[PDB]
Design a binder for this molecule. Structure first.
Ligand SMILES: COC(=O)c1ccc(-c2[nH]nc3c2Cc2cc(CN[C@H]4CC[C@@H](O)CC4)ccc2-3)o1
Length: 270
């Protein structure tokens, strides 16, 4: 009972705008959590969205505490770090690992879309890994409700990260939320398989993007990707968001359902 509420801040996990993420260890139990420290409406929405979240591939929210002009968000600690540091530059990672991470990303995104939430900034920096390398979607600072009382709200706000944003966000005034997150998942899949981003932004003025629309797959990063995951990327990275593949159909794709990876190495004797 005494001192069970005391947490020691032992190391900086992440820094940026606006604030830092610190690893916190409980004085009594030694339980590890991540404390998001935001130096104070945007944070009020983040807390509200985080309270709704309960899924094995979404970073858990334990609660928050306001100490004057500072908000403390208590969130799941993921010891495996970011997916970003598992991607070898210009190489990627083994195809079975990327497939497993992509299945977990799809389970997380299905869950969020199912409760009417769009993340809007899916990228490897935001995809965290637990001790068993289970992928968790993190940072709901740009997230929003796109479906309320079974009525879909079209989005118009410009946000995300240019190499991961869908082309409609740059060409159209209004757009559906769900195909935007599907596109960013395809850029994450491209990053995991080739270890590089295909373009700075998806616009006609961008040569790499024009080459993709012209199906010049003999060029990088596409030439490093096998034909089965590349056929899936041809369905995701579709300019027209109405023709773009939906997640129920991604789950029926040949590469998505290809047996590739063995389960976690279990102790055995002969
Ligand atoms: C903006 O971040 C969040 O909203 C959020 C929610 C939950 C978390 C989180 N839980 N566990 C971690 C996070 C962020 C995070 C980052 C890292 C990578 N940290 C390295 C530490 C040593 C190295 O030298 C620098 C980077 C390792 C673990 C973790 O972050």
């Amino acid at each position: 009972v005494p001192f069970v509420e005391d947490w020691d801040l032992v190391q900086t996990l992440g820094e940026g705008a606006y604030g830092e993420v610190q690893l916190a260890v409980n004085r009594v139990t030694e339980e590890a959590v991540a404390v998001k420290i935001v130096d104070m409406e945007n944070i009020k929405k983040e807390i509200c969205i985080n309270k709704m979240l309960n899924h094995e591939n979404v970073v858990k929210f334990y609660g928050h505490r306001r100490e004057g002009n500072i908000q403390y968000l208590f969130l799941e600690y993921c010891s495996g770090g970011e997916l970003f540091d598992r991607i070898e530059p210009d190489i990627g990672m083994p195809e079975p690992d990327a497939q497993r991470f992509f299945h977990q990303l799809m389970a997380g995104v299905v869950y969020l879309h199912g409760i009417g939430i769009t993340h809007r900034d899916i990228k490897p920096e935001n995809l965290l890994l637990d001790e068993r390398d289970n992928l968790k979607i993190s940072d709901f600072g740009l997230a929003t409700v796109f479906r309320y009382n079974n009525r879909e709200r079209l989005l118009n706000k410009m946000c995300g990260t240019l190499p991961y944003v869908a082309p409609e966000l740059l060409k159209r005034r209004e757009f559906h939320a769900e195909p935007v997150d599907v596109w960013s998942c395809g850029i994450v899949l491209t990053a995991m398989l080739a270890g590089e981003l295909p373009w700075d932004q998806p616009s006609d003025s961008c040569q790499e993007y024009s080459d993709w629309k012209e199906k010049k797959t003999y060029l990088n990063p596409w030439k490093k990707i096998d034909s089965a995951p590349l056929a899936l990327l041809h369905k995701i990275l579709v300019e027209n968001p109405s023709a773009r593949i939906t997640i129920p159909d991604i789950k029926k794709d040949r590469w998505y359902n290809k047996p590739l990876k063995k389960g976690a190495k279990r102790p055995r004797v002969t």
